[PDB]
CSV table of C-alpha atoms in Angstrom, one decimal:
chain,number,residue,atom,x,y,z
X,15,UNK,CA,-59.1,13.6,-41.6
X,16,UNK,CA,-55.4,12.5,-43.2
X,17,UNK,CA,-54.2,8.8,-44.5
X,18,UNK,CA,-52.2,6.6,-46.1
X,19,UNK,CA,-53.5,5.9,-49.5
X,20,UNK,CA,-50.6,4.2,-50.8
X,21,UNK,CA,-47.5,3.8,-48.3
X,22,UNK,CA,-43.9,3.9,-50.2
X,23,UNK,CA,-42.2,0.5,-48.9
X,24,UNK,CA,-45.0,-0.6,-47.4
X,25,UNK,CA,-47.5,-2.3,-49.8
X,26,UNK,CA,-47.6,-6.3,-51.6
X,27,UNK,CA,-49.3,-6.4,-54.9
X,28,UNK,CA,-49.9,-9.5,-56.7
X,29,UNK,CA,-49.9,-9.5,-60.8
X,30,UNK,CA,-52.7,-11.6,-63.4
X,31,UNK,CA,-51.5,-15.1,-62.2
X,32,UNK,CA,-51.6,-14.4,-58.4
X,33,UNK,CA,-48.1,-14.4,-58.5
X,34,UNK,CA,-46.4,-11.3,-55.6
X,35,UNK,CA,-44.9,-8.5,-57.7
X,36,UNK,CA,-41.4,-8.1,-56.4
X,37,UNK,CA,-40.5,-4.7,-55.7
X,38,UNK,CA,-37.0,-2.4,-54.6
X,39,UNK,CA,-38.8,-1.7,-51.1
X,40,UNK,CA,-37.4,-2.9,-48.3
X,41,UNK,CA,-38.7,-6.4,-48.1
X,42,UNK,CA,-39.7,-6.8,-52.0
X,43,UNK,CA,-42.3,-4.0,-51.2
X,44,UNK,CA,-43.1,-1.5,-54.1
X,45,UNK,CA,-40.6,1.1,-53.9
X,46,UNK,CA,-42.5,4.7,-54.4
X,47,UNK,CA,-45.9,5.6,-55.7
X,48,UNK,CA,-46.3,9.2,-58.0
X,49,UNK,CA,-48.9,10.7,-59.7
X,50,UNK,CA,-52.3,10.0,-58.3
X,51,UNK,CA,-56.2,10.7,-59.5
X,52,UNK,CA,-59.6,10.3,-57.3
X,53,UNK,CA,-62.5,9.8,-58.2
X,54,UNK,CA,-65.4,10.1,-56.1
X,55,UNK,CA,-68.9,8.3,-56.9
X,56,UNK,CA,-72.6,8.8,-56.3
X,57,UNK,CA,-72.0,6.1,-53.0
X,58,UNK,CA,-69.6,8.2,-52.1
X,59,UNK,CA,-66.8,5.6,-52.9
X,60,UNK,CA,-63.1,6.6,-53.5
X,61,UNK,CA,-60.9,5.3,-55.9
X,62,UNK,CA,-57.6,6.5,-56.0
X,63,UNK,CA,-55.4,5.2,-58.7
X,64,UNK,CA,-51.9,6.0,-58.9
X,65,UNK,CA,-48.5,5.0,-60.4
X,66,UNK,CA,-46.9,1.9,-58.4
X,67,UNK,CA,-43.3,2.4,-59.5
X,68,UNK,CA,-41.9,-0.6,-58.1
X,69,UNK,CA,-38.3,-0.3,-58.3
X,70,UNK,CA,-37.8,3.5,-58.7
X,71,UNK,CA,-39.2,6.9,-58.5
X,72,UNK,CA,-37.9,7.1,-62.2
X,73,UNK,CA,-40.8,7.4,-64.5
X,74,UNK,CA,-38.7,5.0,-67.2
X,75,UNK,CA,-39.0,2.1,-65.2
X,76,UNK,CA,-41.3,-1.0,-64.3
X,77,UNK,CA,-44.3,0.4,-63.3
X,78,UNK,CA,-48.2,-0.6,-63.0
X,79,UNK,CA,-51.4,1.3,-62.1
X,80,UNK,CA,-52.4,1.0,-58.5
X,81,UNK,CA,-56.0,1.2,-57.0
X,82,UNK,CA,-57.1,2.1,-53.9
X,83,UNK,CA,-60.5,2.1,-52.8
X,84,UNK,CA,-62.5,3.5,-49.2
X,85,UNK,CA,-66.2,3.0,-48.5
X,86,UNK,CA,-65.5,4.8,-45.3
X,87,UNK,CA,-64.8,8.2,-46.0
X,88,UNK,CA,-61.1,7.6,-46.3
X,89,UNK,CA,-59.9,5.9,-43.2
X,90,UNK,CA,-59.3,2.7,-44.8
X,91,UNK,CA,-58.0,1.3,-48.4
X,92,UNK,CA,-58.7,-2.1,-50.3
X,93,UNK,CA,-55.6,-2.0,-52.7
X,94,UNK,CA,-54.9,-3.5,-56.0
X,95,UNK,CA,-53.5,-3.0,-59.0
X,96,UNK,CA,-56.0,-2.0,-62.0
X,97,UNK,CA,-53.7,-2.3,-64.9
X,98,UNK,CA,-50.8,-4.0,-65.9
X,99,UNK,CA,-48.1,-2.8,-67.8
X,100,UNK,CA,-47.5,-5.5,-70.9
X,101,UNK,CA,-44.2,-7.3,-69.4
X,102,UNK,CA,-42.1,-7.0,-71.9
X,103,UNK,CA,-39.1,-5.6,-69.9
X,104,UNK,CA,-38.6,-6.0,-66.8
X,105,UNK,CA,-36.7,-2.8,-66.3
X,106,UNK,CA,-38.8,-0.4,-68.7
X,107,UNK,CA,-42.2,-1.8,-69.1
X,108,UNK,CA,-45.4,0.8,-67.8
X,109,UNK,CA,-48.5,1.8,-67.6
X,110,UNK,CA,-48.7,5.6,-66.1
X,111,UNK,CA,-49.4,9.1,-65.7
X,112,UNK,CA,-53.4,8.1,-64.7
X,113,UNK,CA,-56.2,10.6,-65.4
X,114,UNK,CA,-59.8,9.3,-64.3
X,115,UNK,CA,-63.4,10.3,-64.8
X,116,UNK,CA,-66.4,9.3,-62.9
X,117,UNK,CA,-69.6,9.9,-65.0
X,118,UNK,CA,-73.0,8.8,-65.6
X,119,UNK,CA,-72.5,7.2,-69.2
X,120,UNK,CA,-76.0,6.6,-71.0
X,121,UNK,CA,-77.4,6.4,-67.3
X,122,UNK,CA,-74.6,4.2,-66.6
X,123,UNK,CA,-72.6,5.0,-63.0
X,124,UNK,CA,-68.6,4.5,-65.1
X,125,UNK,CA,-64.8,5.0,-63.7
X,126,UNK,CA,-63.0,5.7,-66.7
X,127,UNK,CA,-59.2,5.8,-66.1
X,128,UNK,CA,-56.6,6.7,-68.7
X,129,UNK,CA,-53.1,6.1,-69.1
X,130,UNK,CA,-50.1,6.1,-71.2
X,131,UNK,CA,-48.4,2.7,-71.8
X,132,UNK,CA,-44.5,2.1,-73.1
X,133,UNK,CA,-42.5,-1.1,-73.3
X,134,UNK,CA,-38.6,-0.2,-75.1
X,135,UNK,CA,-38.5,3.1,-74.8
X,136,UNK,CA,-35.4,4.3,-72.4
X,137,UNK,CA,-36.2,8.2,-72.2
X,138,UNK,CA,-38.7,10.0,-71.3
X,139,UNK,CA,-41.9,10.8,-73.8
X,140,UNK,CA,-40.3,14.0,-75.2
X,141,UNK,CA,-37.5,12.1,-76.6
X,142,UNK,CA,-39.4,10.3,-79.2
X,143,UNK,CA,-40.7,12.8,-82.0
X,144,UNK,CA,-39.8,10.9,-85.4
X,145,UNK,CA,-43.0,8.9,-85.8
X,146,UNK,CA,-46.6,9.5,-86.3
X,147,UNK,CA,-47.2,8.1,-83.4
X,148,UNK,CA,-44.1,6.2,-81.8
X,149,UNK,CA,-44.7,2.6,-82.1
X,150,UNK,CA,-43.5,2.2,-78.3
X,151,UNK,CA,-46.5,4.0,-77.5
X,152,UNK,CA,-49.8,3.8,-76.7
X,153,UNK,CA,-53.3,5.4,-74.2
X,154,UNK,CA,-55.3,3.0,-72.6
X,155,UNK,CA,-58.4,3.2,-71.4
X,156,UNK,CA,-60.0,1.4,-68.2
X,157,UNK,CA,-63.4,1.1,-67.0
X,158,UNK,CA,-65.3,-0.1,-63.9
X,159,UNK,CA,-69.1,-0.5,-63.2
X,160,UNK,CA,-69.1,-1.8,-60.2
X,161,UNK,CA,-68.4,0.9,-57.9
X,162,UNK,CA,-64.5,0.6,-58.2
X,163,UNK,CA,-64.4,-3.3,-57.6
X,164,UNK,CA,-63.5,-4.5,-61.0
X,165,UNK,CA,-62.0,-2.2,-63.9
X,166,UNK,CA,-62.0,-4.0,-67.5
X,167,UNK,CA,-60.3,-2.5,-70.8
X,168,UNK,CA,-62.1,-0.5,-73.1
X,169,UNK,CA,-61.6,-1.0,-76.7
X,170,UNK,CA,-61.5,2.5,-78.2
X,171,UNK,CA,-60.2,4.6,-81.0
X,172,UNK,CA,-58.2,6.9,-79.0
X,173,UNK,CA,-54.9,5.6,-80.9
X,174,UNK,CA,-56.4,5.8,-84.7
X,175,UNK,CA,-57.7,9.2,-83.9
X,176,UNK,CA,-53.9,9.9,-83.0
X,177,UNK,CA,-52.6,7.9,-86.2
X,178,UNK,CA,-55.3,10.1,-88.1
X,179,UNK,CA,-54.1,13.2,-87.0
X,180,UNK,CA,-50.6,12.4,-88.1
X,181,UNK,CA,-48.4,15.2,-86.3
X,182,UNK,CA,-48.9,13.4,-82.8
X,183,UNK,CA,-46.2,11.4,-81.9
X,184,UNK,CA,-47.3,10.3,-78.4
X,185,UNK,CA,-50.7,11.5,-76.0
X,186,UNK,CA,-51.2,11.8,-72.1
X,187,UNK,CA,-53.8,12.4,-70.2
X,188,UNK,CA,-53.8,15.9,-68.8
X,189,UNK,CA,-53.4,13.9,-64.8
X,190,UNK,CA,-55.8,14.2,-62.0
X,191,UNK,CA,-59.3,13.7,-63.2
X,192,UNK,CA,-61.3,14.9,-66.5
X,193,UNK,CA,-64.8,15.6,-66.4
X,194,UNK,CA,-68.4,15.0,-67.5
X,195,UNK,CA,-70.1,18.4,-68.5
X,196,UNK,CA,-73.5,18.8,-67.9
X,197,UNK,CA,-75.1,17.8,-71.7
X,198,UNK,CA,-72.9,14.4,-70.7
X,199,UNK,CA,-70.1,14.8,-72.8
X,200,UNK,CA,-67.0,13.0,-71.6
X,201,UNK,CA,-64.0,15.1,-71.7
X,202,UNK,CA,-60.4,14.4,-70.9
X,203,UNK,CA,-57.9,17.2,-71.0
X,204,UNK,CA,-54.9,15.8,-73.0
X,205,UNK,CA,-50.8,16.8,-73.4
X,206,UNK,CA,-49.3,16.0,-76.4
X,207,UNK,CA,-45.6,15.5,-77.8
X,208,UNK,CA,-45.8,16.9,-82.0
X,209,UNK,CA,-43.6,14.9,-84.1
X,210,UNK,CA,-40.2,16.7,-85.2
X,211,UNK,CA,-41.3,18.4,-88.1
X,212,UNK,CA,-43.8,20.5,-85.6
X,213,UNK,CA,-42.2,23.7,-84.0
X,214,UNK,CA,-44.0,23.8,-80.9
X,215,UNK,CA,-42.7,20.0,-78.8
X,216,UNK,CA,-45.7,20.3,-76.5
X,217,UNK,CA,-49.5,21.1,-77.1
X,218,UNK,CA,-53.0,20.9,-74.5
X,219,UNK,CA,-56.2,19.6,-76.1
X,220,UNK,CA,-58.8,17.3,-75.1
X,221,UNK,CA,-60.8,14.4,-76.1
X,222,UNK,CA,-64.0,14.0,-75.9
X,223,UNK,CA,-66.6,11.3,-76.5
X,224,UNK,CA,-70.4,10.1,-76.1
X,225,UNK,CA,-70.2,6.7,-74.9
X,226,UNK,CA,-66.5,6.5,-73.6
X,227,UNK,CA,-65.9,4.1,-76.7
X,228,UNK,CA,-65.2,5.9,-79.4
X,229,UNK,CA,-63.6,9.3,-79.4
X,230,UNK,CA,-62.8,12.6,-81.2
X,231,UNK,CA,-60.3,15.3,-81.0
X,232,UNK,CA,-60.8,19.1,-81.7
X,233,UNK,CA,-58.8,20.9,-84.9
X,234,UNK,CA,-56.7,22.8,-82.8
X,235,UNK,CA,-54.6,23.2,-80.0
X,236,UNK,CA,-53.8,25.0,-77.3
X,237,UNK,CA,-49.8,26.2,-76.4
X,238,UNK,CA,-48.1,23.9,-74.2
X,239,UNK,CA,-46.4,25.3,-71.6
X,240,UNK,CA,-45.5,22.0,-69.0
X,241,UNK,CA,-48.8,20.3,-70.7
X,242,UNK,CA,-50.0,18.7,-67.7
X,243,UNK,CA,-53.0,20.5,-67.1
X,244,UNK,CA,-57.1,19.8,-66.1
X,245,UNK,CA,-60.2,21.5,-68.1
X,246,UNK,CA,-63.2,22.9,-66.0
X,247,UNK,CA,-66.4,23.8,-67.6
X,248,UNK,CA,-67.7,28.1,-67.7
X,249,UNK,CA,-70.6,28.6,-69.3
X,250,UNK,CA,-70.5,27.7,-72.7
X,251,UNK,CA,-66.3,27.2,-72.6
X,252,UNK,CA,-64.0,25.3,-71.9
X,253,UNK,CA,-61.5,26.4,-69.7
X,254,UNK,CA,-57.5,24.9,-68.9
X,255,UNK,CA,-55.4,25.3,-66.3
X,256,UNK,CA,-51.9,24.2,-67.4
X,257,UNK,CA,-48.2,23.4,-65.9
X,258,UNK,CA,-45.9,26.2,-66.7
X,259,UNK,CA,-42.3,27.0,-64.8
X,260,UNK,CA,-43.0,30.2,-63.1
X,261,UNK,CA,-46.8,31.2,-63.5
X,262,UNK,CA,-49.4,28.9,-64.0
X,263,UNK,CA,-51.2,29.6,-67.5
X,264,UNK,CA,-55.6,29.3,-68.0
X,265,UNK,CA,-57.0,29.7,-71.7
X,266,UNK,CA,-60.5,29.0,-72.9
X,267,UNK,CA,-62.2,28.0,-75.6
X,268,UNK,CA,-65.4,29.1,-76.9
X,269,UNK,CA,-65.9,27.0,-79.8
X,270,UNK,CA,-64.9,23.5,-78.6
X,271,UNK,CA,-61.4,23.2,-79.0
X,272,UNK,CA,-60.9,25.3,-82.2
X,273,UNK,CA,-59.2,28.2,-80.4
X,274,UNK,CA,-57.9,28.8,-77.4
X,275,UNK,CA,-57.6,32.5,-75.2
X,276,UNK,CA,-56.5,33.9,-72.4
X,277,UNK,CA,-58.9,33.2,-69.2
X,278,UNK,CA,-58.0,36.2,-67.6
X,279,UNK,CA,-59.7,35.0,-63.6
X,280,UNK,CA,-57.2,32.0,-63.5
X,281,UNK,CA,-54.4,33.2,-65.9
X,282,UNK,CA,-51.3,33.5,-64.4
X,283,UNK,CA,-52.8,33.3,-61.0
X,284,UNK,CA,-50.5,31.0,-59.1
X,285,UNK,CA,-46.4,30.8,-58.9
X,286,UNK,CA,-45.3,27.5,-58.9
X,287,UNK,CA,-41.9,29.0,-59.6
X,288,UNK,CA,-38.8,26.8,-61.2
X,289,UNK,CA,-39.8,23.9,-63.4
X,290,UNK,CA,-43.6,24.0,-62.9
X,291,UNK,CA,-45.7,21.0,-61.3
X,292,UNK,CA,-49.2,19.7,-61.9
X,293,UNK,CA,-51.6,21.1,-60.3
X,294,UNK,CA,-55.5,19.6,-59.9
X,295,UNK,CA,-58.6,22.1,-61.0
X,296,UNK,CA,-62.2,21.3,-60.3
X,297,UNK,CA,-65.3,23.6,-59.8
X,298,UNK,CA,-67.5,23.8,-57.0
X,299,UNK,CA,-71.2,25.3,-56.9
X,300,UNK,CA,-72.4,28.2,-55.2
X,301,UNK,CA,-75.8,28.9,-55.7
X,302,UNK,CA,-75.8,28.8,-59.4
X,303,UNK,CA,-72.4,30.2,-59.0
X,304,UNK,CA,-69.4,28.5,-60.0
X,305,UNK,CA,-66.1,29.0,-58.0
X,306,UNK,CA,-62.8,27.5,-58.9
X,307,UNK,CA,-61.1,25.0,-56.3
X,308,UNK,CA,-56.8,24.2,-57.5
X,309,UNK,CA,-53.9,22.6,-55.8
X,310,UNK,CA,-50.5,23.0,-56.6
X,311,UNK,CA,-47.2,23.8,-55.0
X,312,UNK,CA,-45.8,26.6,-53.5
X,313,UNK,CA,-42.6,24.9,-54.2
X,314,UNK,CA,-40.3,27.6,-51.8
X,315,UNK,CA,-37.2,26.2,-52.4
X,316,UNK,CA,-37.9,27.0,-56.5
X,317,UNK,CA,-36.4,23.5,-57.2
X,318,UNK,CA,-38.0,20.0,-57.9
X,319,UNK,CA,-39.1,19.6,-54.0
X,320,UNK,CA,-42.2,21.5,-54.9
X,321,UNK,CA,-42.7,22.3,-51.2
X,322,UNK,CA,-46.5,23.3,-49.5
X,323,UNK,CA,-49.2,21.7,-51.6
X,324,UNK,CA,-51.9,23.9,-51.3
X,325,UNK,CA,-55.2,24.4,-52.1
X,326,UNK,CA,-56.7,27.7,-54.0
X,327,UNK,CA,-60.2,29.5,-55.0
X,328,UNK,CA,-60.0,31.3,-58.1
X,329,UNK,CA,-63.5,33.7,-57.9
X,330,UNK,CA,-64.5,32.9,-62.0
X,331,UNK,CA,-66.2,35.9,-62.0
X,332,UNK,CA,-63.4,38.8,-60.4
X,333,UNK,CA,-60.3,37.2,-60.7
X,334,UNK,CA,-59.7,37.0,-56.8
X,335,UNK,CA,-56.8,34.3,-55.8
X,336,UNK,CA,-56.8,33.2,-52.3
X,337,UNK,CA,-54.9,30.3,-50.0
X,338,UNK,CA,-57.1,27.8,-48.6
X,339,UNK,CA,-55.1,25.3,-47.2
X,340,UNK,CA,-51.7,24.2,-47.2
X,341,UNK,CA,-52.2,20.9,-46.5
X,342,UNK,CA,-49.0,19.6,-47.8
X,343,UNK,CA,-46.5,22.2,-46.1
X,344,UNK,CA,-43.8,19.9,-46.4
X,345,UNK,CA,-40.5,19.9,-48.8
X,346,UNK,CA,-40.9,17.1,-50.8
X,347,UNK,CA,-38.4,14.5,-52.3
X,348,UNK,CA,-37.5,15.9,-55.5
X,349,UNK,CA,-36.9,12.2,-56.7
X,350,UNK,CA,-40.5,13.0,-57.9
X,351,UNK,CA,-43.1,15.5,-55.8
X,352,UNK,CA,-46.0,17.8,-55.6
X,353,UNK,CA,-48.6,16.2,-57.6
X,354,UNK,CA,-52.3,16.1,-56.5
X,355,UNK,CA,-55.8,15.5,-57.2
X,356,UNK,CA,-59.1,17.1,-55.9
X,357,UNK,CA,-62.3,15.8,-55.6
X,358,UNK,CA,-66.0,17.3,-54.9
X,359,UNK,CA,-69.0,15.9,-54.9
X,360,UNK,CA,-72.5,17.1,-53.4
X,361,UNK,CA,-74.3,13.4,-52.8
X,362,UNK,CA,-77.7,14.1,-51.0
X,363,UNK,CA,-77.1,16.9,-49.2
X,364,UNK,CA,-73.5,15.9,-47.9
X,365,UNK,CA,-70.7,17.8,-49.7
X,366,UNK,CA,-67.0,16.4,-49.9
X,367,UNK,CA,-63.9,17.9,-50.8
X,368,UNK,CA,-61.3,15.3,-50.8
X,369,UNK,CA,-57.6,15.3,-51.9
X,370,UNK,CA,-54.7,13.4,-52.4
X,371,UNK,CA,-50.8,14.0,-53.0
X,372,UNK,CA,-47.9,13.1,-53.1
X,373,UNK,CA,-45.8,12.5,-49.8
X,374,UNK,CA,-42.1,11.3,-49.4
X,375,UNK,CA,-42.8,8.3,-52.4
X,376,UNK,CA,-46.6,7.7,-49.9
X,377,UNK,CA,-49.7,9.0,-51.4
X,378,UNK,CA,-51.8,10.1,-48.7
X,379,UNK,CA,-55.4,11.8,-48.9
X,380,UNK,CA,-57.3,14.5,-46.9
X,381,UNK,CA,-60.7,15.2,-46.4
X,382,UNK,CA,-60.8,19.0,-47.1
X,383,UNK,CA,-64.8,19.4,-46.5
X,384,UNK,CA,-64.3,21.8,-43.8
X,385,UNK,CA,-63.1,24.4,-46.0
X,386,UNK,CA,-66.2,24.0,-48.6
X,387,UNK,CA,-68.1,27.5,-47.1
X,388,UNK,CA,-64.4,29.3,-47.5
X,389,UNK,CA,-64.3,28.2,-51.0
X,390,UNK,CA,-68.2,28.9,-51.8
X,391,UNK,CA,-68.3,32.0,-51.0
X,392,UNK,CA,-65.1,32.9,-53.1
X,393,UNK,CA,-67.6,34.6,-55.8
C-alpha cells in the first residue's frame, strides 16, 4: 500500500564501531533523509538507500548513506547504514546523492550503489571547477551479493577514468537507479561539473562497464540542463531523461554515447516548472512493446516545494503523455523535496511497480502495481 521507509526524527543508526550516530532530531535522531533509489531483486527484495542527513536538510553537511530493506512487499524495513562518509569533519563530511543498480553480473545476482563523497568542501559541487578533478572529491561504488544484507566497497577505476579525461572536475550519478541492458552491460547515467576552462558548467553522460569493476566513459556528452537525469534503453539507443527548470528535456544516442539528439516521444514532455527536480524513468514491457513509466513533480506553487509527485507514461512509439498517479499530492518542504525513484520488475508472473519519495524530511514508498495495465497499454 503506503510506508515509512525512512522516518525524519524518528530513526537511530549506529556507525563502524557500534557506536549511536548522534543526530539534530529530536532526541539525537537523524534529522531529515533526501534523495532516495530502490532497487528491486529477483526475490523480490527492496532496498532503498537514501541520504541520512543527520543534522540538516543541507546537502553540505554530515551525511551517510542509509539502507532500508523489506522482504515483505514493503510493509516493513530492516535499516542501516551502507556507507560511511570518511569522518573527517564533523560538520561537512558525506557520502550522497545514491544511484543503484540491480543486475545479474557474470550470472551473479549484484546491488551496485553509487555515490559522491566530499570531506572540506563548504559549497555545493558546482562551486569547485579549478581542478581536474577537485581533490575533495570523489564516486564510490558499493556492492552487495547477498540479497541487500551486506554491501562491501568495490575497487574501481571510475576516478582515473575521470583524472584521464581531464576536463571533469567532479561526477554524480544521474539519482534513482541505472540500469542493466539486455546484452548485460552495466550502465549508470552520470552528471558532470567541467572544470572552468569548459563553457558549458554541466554535462549528462554515462558509464558503463562489464563486470562493475572497471569502467569506461563515452567521447561525448550530452547538454546539461539540471544534470540529474536516468537513461532507459530503445532499441538500439540510449535514451535520457534529464532535470531542466521548466520542461523536462529526452535526447538519445545512437552510437553509444558519441552524440546525443532530440527523443522527440519524451522531449519536453513534462513541466516541472521553476528550478527543475529529479525525476525517475524506467521502462515497462508490453508485449514486446516498450512503454515509458516517470515520476516527477508537478511542483504548483513553481517554487522549491515541488508539490504532487506524480507518475507518467510516455507511449515511446506516439509521443502520448498521460497522468497516472499523483501519489505525492502534497506541497513539500522546500528545505529539500520532490525526488523519487521507480521500480518494476516482472518476477514469475507477479509484476511490481514500486516507488519512493520524498515526504516532509520521511522517505516513504508505494506500491503502484495497480496501475501496471494503465501504463501497458500506453502504446
Amino acid at each position: 500500500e503506503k510506508s515509512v521507509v525512512f522516518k525524519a526524527e524518528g530513526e537511530h543508526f549506529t556507525d563502524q564501531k557500534g557506536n549511536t550516530i548522534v543526530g539534530s532530531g529530536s532526541g539525537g535522531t537523524t534529522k531529515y533523509f533526501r534523495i532516495p533509489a530502490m532497487c528491486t531483486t529477483s526475490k523480490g527484495t527492496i532496498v532503498v538507500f537514501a541520504d541520512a542527513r543527520h543534522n540538516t536538510a543541507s546537502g553540505q553537511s554530515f551525511i551517510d548513506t542509509a539502507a532500508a530493506r523489506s522482504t515483505d512487499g514493503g510493509k516493513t524495513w530492516n535499516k542501516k547504514i551502507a556507507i560511511y562518509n570518511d569522518r573527517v569533519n564533523s560538520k561537512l563530511s558525506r557520502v550522497m546523492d545514491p544511484t543503484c543498480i540491480v543486475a545479474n553480473i557474470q550470472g551473479r545476482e549484484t546491488i551496485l550503489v553509487m555515490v559522491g563523497k566530499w570531506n572540506n568542501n563548504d559549497k555545493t559541487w558546482g562551486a569547485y571547477r579549478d581542478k581536474a578533478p577537485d581533490t575533495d572529491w570523489d564516486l564510490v561504488l558499493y556492492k552487495s551479493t547477498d540479497d541487500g544484507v551486506t554491501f562491501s566497497k568495490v575497487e574501481t577505476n571510475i576516478h582515473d577514468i575521470v583524472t584521464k579525461n581531464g576536463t571533469i572536475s567532479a561526477m554524480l550519478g544521474g539519482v534513482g537507479s541505472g540500469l542493466q541492458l539486455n546484452d548485460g552491460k552495466l550502465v549508470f547515467p552520470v552528471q558532470m561539473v567541467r572544470t572552468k576552462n569548459i563553457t558549458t558548467v554541466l554535462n549528462t553522460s554515462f558509464i558503463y562497464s562489464t563486470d562493475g569493476i572497471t569502467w569506461s566513459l563515452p567521447s561525448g556528452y550530452c547538454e546539461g540542463f539540471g544534470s540529474e537525469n536516468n537513461i532507459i534503453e530503445f532499441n538500439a539507443s540510449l535514451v535520457n531523461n534529464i532535470r531542466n527548470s521548466g520542461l523536462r528535456r529526452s535526447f538519445e544516442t545512437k552510437d553509444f554515447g558519441k552524440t546525443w539528439t532530440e527523443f522527440p516521444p519524451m522531449d519536453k514532455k513534462v513541466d516541472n516548472r521553476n528550478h527543475g527536480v529529479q525525476g525517475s524513468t524506467i521502462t515497462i514491457p508490453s508485449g514486446n512493446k516498450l512503454v515509458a513509466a516517470h515520476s516527477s513533480a508537478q511542483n504548483k506553487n513553481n517554487d522549491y516545494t515541488r508539490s504532487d509527485i506524480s507518475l507518467y507514461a510516455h507511449n515511446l512509439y506516439s509521443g502520448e503523455v498521460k497522468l497516472i498517479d499523483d501519489f505525492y499530492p502534497k506541497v513539500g518542504n522546500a528545505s529539500g523535496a520532490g525526488y523519487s525513484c521507480l521500480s518494476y520488475r516482472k518476477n514469475v508472473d507477479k509484476e511490481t511497480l514500486y516507488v519512493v519519495y520524498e515526504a516532509n524530511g520521511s522517505i516513504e514508498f508505494q506500491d503502484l502495481s495497480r496501475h501496471l495495465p494503465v501504463i501497458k497499454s500506453y502504446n
